[PDB]
């Protein structure tokens, strides 16, 4: 649609274009990337993965699930 005037006092996001979008994008990407790396480390601290191919779980190891002893 043909663009029409919008109130400057109104805090609207209707077709808002920022000339300095490059620096803002870089700043919002870099610290976000750092936070994402920290969160990824925190999440990978406690992880479970299927055993590797060719590796069989010997049932005598404590890694095998345990039963409550009455």
């Amino acid at each position: 649609f043909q663009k029409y005037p919008i109130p400057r006092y109104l805090h609207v996001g209707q077709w808002i274009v920022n000339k300095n979008w490059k620096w803002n994008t870089f700043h919002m990407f870099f610290p976000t990337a750092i936070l994402c790396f920290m969160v990824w480390r925190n999440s990978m601290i406690s992880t479970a993965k299927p055993p590797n191919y060719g590796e069989y779980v010997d049932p005598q190891s404590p890694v095998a699930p345990k039963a409550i002893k009455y």
Partner: protein, 175 residues
């Protein structure tokens, strides 16, 4: 281009002057909006008068499609034979065997591990070892189909053995 078109006219969102009293008898029955308020629900099939009349018309019109479906089903059933499908015959201890094992286990009818004298029956969701309903009938049908397929294979093997033996005897009988 070619004409300095003015700004978008304010008439694009005309203001509605409510000419009828919005009686409390229709509370929330009309979606109110300062521009073009609407009814709460839309009936684009207003050619149909009423719900009973609409249902009657729909059931009258659906008869042709039902008859077409019946014709397709008949054309398929008069030109095809039953197939040989079922659970994997080589595996009887899996989905099939586990059901019979659980029905023979009945561990939900045992005593408490601490001697509490309370069994699985003492619960709203209580174990029942003699249900014999629901998916049990379907499991029995699947087991019967698997048994029929296995018996067919065994009969085929026996008939092939009989054919080979008869051929050997006839070749031997001639001498």
């Amino acid at each position: 281009h070619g004409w300095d078109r003015p700004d978008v006219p304010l008439s694009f969102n005309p203001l509605y002057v409510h000419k009828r009293e919005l009686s409390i008898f229709d509370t929330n029955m009309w979606m109110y909006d300062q521009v073009y308020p609407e009814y709460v629900i839309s009936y684009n099939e207003i050619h149909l008068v009423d719900q009973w009349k609409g249902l009657k018309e729909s059931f009258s019109q659906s008869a042709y499609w039902w008859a077409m479906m019946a014709m397709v089903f008949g054309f398929y059933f008069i030109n095809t034979t039953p197939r040989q499908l079922g659970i994997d015959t080589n595996d009887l201890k899996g989905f099939l065997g586990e059901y019979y094992g659980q029905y023979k286990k009945r561990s939900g009818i045992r005593s408490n591990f601490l001697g509490l004298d309370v069994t699985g029956e003492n619960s709203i969701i209580q174990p029942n070892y003699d249900r014999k309903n629901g998916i049990r009938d379907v499991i029995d049908s699947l087991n019967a189909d698997a048994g029929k397929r296995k018996l067919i294979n065994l009969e085929a093997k026996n008939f092939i053995e009989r054919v080979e033996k008869e051929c050997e005897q006839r070749i031997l009988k001639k001498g």
